Design a protein around this nucleic acid. Structure first.
Ligand code: FES
Ligand code: FES
Lengths: 142, 281, 13, 451, 94, 233, 130
RNA sequence: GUUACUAAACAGGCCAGGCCGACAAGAAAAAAAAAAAAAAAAAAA
RNA sequence: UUCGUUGACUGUGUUUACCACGGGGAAUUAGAACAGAAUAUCAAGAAAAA
RNA sequence: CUUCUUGGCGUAACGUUGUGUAGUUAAA
């Protein structure tokens, strides 16, 4: 067919033209995850596929599904990592290094993993603030 | 003589397990296909000739030559090849220790060996050449200077001098000659490979234009004729547009009738990947 | 909100 | 075998000299110390005295601080011994240190280029008690924290409050140093007015080192566009000095290579980020000075490779991905560079993040900006992710999916919140594989695969 | 530069760092030698096993000369971590 | 750096054709994005004498001595040491008891440099449209250096490339500049030296070491070539 | 002579997400979910995936998640499976009309049991998230 | 959402029912190179 | 590497793809749990000033 | 910081049941 090149320009960052499938993909967030719905030209036609993609974008905007989910714990140095799906806690090891530990949400439970991370960070913070190195003992004389 | 009507050697008989006679085990799929696994041929069933002086004594002679030259030369050649294939761009100097402060590594071979936890014993085992292909390759490029002299030294009688006393600046000369003399184009094989493929140079986009001087205007002008701009674009960039008619027939129309519209196979095979050189950014 | 339980919370402890 | 730390009524702390020597000997190794001292008869009891002599009944924080000063003076930069000594000093610092001593220890840590978060945590805890600091000492402490990447929530506001009354009256050089430290710490580590005040002081005001520090601070703060007049003035002031100084100053002088690296970094940033905006509009003198600097090859000190980068390289090799490790592009070093595609793999370690934070440092961010402006795509593997994965199969799956995410030319949405299901980290069936072992369609290497 | 590298005089500290060392991958017993080993243990190459030293130095064409040769990991002393260096200092002093 | 016509030459044709093309050549040139293509040859002569590092000699001698003491060395039996071939030479000690010269500076590496007027550079030639760089190099050797001079070429690929943009007046003629691709070569030992063919654009030639190269060639050309030049300090 | 044949039998399909390969090369599921198909343009083969989901009503507005789609690489196949998937195990979702009765009886007892018998009591569903 | 099963005729023809305690199971590791030349050893780990 | 090894295990749990039935047996799931024994593979190794 | 592998191979997969051999009963 004959089509102007401006057809493939999208007016919103969440609306993308996918040329392999020749479809308009609309991104959104559902159930604390990212999803994309395609609108194919083979289904709707040239102009109608884009029109329906824009209408679905407006629907998701009204539903509030364009907002980025956020995971926070309120404790500095403890944050959720998507790549490993784990709660990461950062502290200082015995060697005086900066080290981290990751507790798996799939295994422990999301909140269980968060709690384990926070408690481990607190324990290591206590040990570090103590100040004693390896194989060290504190004695007070008066 | 040198020129001769050479016969095509008969293919070597690949063995087979005496099973699965009713099935086609020679599909053209690539190892290791999840749904088209390839049948293995045990090494104990591959037909091999009995060992005589032609296949055993020659190996013994080449092994004695390698012993005289020293396994250290073979180890050094292998190490130099492996480091060269991976250090084709300027690296930062690397020490083998966190606190040496003075010792230098000697190549990215260090990084690769540390990452793979490669076997110190394994390198010696490889250099000792326990395999037929290894001995055959030493008989062909066994010379220490091979990156620069190739197989020219394969029969030289004072070749061990390179192994004994080719060091330092001479090793640098060997490497610098080899880098310029090595192949840099596409390798074309149907055999399986599993190692990092050797580099293929990228190719520049534009071609060169021929220009000749014209005194009528005292300027240089293109040798090629003008032609229409559309014809120039077709000649340069390609067919233009997303669809065009097939190439016109270049042979005289056949007197007989043939069903030339019929495709070669009912179900065409999948498209072949482009193995040629990539463009330059 | 409630969360689904992990593999650990499903073993016969 | 073990060390004992004693505490007095008045809060002082100390250890026995003999016990300290035995502890150091057993912690490092008497063979190592014998080799270092060039004597096979050195007993464990004399190790501390021998070290003191090399760098020249109770040992204290002042004694260990003096040891650090002597180590800096004699260019003794052994990391194991310094780590043990710093552990002991961190133990001793509690309740027995004065402000000049804290400043001296911080400066020694800066000079030795050691990251000791435990020692600086102890220093911060002691400091909060001491102050309910001269401007020089405050600036030195701020520089120490910036070098340590320790964005401490408590002490930093205290130091900035102490410095607040003196900001209008700081000398240009002190202002440049403080601005560089603030840029290293991030613009959010100090009040809003601080950067404007420091820049105004610098503008009112200075050697080539101070000028390059100020320019690097601008680049780190990402205000080079908003501070064009100041950046142009800085470059104009520098260029005559760069021309005046001799050629060998950039290669032989102790302060030559680092200044050369910083100037080349400034050149690369201006070239690749603001070519049309700034670089091509610069004075011919500035451009000629930059060309003169660029003509000279840069020297880099030997470094050991990180096992993180080493394992990443090994996994790429297994995946048949051609790459180069520790490649050089101008003043930048790439942990891993791909041969057949324009992608740089960055194996970020803890030192590239602020202490106990998920945020990369300003230097890392600037390097990433330059790498992206050059046309290369950066794939970051965080150290905590690497440690959690911990396994060859998990890391291979991560490498494949991350490479696809970086190199894809279609479905170009925000990289964050992309799905991940790695083996033995997410729940999955055992035989659920994305990377079948050794299987490549058409024997095509992953370096040639078209995503 | 190149001249200094050729003229280099290794310090005793550098030589100690370059000292070779055997790290044992796993626990195992020798069949013919009856030696007992524990994983993670560190020994000197010279005294760890003479039969294995044969292959490691180039006076053996058999990789099975030492029955537990594959359980060896040959590293230089300077590459070891501080913990292992301090732990096994006594047995690596030469 | 400065190849200007005044410093290059005046009143000649072949010499100026290469660098300015002011007298237009008689063949078809080849431009790549408006820059004329040129091939440059960098012939080198390897050191005539062999030097061995002390650590190598020490390790070898110590290994021989250690093997002798421990009785672990090679056997080398008489039945495989003495079998009467024309090249036989061994005999036991017991039985015995019963600036233009190739020979210059034999302990270093030399590079052939050519003087185009007052400028010292490497041999250079233009590429005629449609012919290989190997053919261009062969023409360079046969017409500029010596009709019988045929150094060994290390490969078909260049080891470096450089660019030079003409001034405004010169580029107004339709050629923006010249781009040069450098190729390494070995002077085969025992081969005759150069003999400049009659009419050749070369004025003189020399064989200089790396240390002397900057004393003759411009720093820009030295920067262009040093990456590919061998390492010798 | 497979390359010359035309019947659809000779050309096998390929496993994808949450799918295994059997001894005779059958493609079998590995998780509780809903089937999806994909077309691999590079290899010109069909790929079978299973999107993990707990049992619930299949709505008309959710049918687009199981369309057959074109991909170039298995990495893109995994990406598409993630994008169309309904929810993740660690967060779950609000089930829309999930089943509440016991499962169908074993085949050897009765081949024609009734789905979600209202006369049977509600029993917990604690197997379809695995 | 979704096009895939399916060879009846004494129709046009196929069949060897067998191998392996392991270079044939198999952890980890490794694994087959364009053209031309050398060698005439059926040779990737 | 010329590299180990014998899970080509002993048992508890009646749930599961296909379907006249039989041979869950053209050759289906980690019935992801539980009680024993065995084999191979760990991880970490961060920080090189002026 | 849960756990890097594993109860053959087999593009002809062994003859079901029975008999015989063999295994099990401080219980079934
Ligand atoms: S082996 Fe050929 S020249 Fe050395
Ligand atoms: S340990 Fe006994 S022979 Fe090697």
């Amino acid at each position: 067919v004959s089509i102007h090149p401006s057809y493939f320009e999208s007016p919103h960052p969440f609306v993308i033209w996918e040329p392999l499938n020749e479809a308009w993909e609309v991104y959104f967030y559902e159930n604390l995850k990212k999803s994309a719905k395609p609108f194919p030209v083979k289904k709707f036609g040239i102009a109608r596929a884009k029109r329906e993609a824009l209408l679905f974008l407006e629907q998701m905007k009204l539903e509030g599904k364009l907002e980025k989910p956020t995971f926070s714990s309120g404790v500095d140095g403890v944050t959720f990592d998507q790549v490993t799906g784990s709660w990461i806690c950062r502290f200082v090891d015995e060697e005086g290094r900066c080290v981290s530990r990751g507790f798996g949400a799939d295994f422990h439970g999301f909140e269980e993993a968060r709690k384990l991370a926070i408690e481990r960070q607190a324990e290591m913070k206590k040990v570090e603030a103590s100040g004693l190195g390896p194989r060290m003992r504190l004695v007070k004389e008066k | 003589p040198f020129k001769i009507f050479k016969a095509s050697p008969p293919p070597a008989p690949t063995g087979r397990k005496p099973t699965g006679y009713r099935g086609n085990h020679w599909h053209k799929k690539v190892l290791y296909d999840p749904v088209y696994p390839t049948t293995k041929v045990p090494a104990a069933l591959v037909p091999r000739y009995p060992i005589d002086w032609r296949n055993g004594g020659r190996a013994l002679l080449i092994a004695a030559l390698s012993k005289l030259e020293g396994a250290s030369a073979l180890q050094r050649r292998i190490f130099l090849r492996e480091n060269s294939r991976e250090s084709q761009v300027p690296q930062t100097p690397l020490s083998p220790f966190q606190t040496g402060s003075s010792a230098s590594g000697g190549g990215a071979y260090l990084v690769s060996s540390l990452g793979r936890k490669r076997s110190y014993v394994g390198r010696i085992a490889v250099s000792l050449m326990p395999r037929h292909r290894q001995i055959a390759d030493y008989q062909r490029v066994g010379g220490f200077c091979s990156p620069r002299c190739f197989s020219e030294c394969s029969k030289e009688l004072r070749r061990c001098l390179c192994a004994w006393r080719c060091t330092g600046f001479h090793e640098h000369v060997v490497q610098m000659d080899g880098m310029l003399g090595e192949y840099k184009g596409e390798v074309k094989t149907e055999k399986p490979l599993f190692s990092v493929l050797r580099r293929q140079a990228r190719r520049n986009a534009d071609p060169s234009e021929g220009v000749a001087f014209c005194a009528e205007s005292a300027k240089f002008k293109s040798v090629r004729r003008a032609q229409h701009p559309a014809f120039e674009a077709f000649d340069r960039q390609g067919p233009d547009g997303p669809s065009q008619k097939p190439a016109p027939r270049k042979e005289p129309p056949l007197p007989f009738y043939s069903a030339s519209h019929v495709p070669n196979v009912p179900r065409p095979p999948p498209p072949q990947p482009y193995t040629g050189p990539l463009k330059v950014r | 909100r409630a969360f689904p339980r992990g593999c650990e919370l499903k073993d016969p402890a | 075998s073990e060390l004992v730390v004693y505490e007095r009524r008045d809060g002082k702390r100390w250890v026995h000299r003999h016990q300290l020597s035995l502890y150091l000997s057993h912690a490092v190794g008497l063979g190592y110390f014998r080799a270092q001292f060039e004597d096979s008869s050195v007993t464990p009891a004399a190790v501390f005295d021998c070290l003191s002599h090399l760098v020249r009944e109770r040992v204290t924080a002042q004694d260990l601080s003096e040891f650090m000063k002597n180590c800096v003076a004699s260019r003794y930069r052994d990391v194991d011994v310094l780590d043990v000594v710093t552990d002991v000093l961190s133990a001793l610092l509690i309740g027995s240190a004065d402000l000049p001593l804290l400043v001296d220890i911080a400066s020694s840590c800066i000079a030795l280029s050691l990251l000791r978060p435990k020692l600086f945590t102890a220093i911060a805890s002691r400091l909060l008690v001491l102050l309910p600091l001269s401007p020089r000492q405050a600036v030195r402490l701020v520089e120490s924290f910036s070098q340590q990447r320790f964005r401490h929530p408590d002490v930093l506001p205290l130091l900035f409050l102490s410095l607040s009354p003196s900001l209008p009256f700081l000398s240009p050089r002190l202002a440049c140093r403080l601005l560089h430290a603030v840029a290293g710490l991030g613009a959010c580590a100090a009040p809003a007015e601080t950067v404007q005040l420091l820049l105004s002081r610098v503008a009112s005001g200075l050697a080539l080192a101070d000028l390059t520090k100020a320019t690097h601070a601008l680049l780190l703060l990402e205000i080079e566009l908003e501070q064009k007049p100041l950046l142009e003035s800085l470059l104009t002031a520098m260029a005559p000095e760069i021309f005046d100084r001799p050629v060998e100053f950039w290669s032989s002088s102790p302060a030559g290579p680092s200044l050369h690296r910083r100037l080349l970094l400034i050149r690369t940033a201006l070239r690749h980020l603001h070519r049309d905006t700034i670089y091509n509009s610069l004075p011919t003198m500035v451009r000629q000075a930059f060309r003169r600097l660029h003509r000279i090859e840069i020297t880099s000190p030997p470094r050991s490779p990180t096992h993180f980068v080493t394992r990443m390289s090994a996994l790429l090799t297994r995946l048949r991905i051609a790459h180069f490790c520790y490649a050089i592009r101008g003043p930048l070093v790439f942990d891993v560079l791909e041969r057949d595609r324009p992608i740089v793999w960055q194996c970020n370690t803890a030192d590239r993040f602020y202490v106990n934070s998920a945020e990369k440092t300003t230097a890392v961010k600037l390097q990433e900006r330059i790498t992206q402006a050059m046309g290369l795509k950066v794939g970051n593997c965080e150290y905590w992710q690497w440690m959690k994965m911990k396994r060859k199969r998990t890391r291979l799956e991560y490498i494949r999916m991350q490479r696809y995410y970086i190199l894809k030319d279609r479905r170009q949405h925000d990289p964050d919140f992309e799905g991940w299901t790695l083996p033995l980290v997410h729940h999955m069936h055992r035989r659920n594989r994305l990377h079948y072992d050794y299987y490549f369609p058409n024997y095509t290497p992953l370096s040639r695969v078209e995503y | 530069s190149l001249a200094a590298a050729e003229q280099w005089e290794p310090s005793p500290l550098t030589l100690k760092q370059h000292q070779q060392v055997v790290v044992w991958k796993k626990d195992r017993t020798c069949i013919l030698c009856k030696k007992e080993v524990q994983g993670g243990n560190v020994e000197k190459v010279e005294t760890a096993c003479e039969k294995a030293w044969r292959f490691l130095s180039g006076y053996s064409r058999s990789a099975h000369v030492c029955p537990i040769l594959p359980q060896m990991r040959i590293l230089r002393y300077g590459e070891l971590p501080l913990r292992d260096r301090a732990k096994f200092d006594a047995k690596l002093r030469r | 750096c400065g190849p200007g016509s005044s410093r290059f030459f005046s009143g000649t044709s072949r010499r100026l054709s290469l660098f300015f093309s002011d007298p237009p050549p008689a063949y078809a040139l080849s431009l790549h994005a408006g820059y004329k293509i040129q091939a440059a040859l960098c012939v080198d002569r390897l050191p005539l004498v062999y030097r061995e590092p002390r650590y190598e000699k020490r390790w070898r001698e110590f290994k021989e001595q250690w093997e002798a003491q421990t009785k672990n060395g090679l056997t080398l039996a008489d039945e495989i040491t003495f079998m009467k071939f024309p090249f036989h030479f061994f005999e036991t000690e017991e039985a015995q008891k019963k600036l233009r010269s190739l020979e210059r500076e034999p302990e270093r590496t030399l590079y052939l440099i050519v003087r185009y007027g007052d400028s010292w550079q490497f041999p250079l030639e233009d590429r005629i449209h449609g012919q290989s760089m190997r053919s261009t190099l062969k023409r360079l050797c046969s017409e500029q250096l010596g009709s019988s001079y045929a150094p060994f070429l290390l490969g078909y690929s260049p080891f470096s490339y450089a660019k030079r943009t003409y001034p405004k007046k010169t580029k107004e003629a339709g050629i923006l500049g010249r781009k040069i691709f450098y190729y390494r070569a070995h002077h085969i030992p025992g081969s005759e030296n150069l003999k400049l063919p009659e009419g050749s654009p070369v004025s003189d030639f020399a064989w200089v070491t790396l240390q002397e190269l900057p004393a003759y060639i411009s720093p820009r050309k030295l920067a262009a070539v040093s990456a590919g030049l061998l390492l010798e300090e | 002579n497979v390359e010359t044949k035309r019947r659809n039998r000779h050309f096998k399909l390929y496993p994808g997400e949450n799918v295994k390969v059997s001894k005779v090369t059958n493609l079998v599921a590995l998780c509780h979910g809903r089937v999806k198909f994909t077309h691999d343009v590079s290899r010109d083969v069909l790929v079978v995936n299973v999107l993990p989901e707990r049992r619930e009503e299949l709505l008309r507005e959710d049918l687009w998640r199981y369309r057959t789609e074109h991909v170039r690489s298995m990495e893109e196949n995994r990406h598409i499976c993630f994008l169309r998937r309904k929810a993740v195990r660690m967060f779950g979702k609000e089930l829309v009309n999930p089943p509440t009765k016991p499962p169908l009886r074993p085949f050897y007892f009765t081949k024609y049991d009734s789905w979600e018998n209202p006369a049977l009591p509600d029993v917990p569903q604690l197997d379809d998230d695995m």
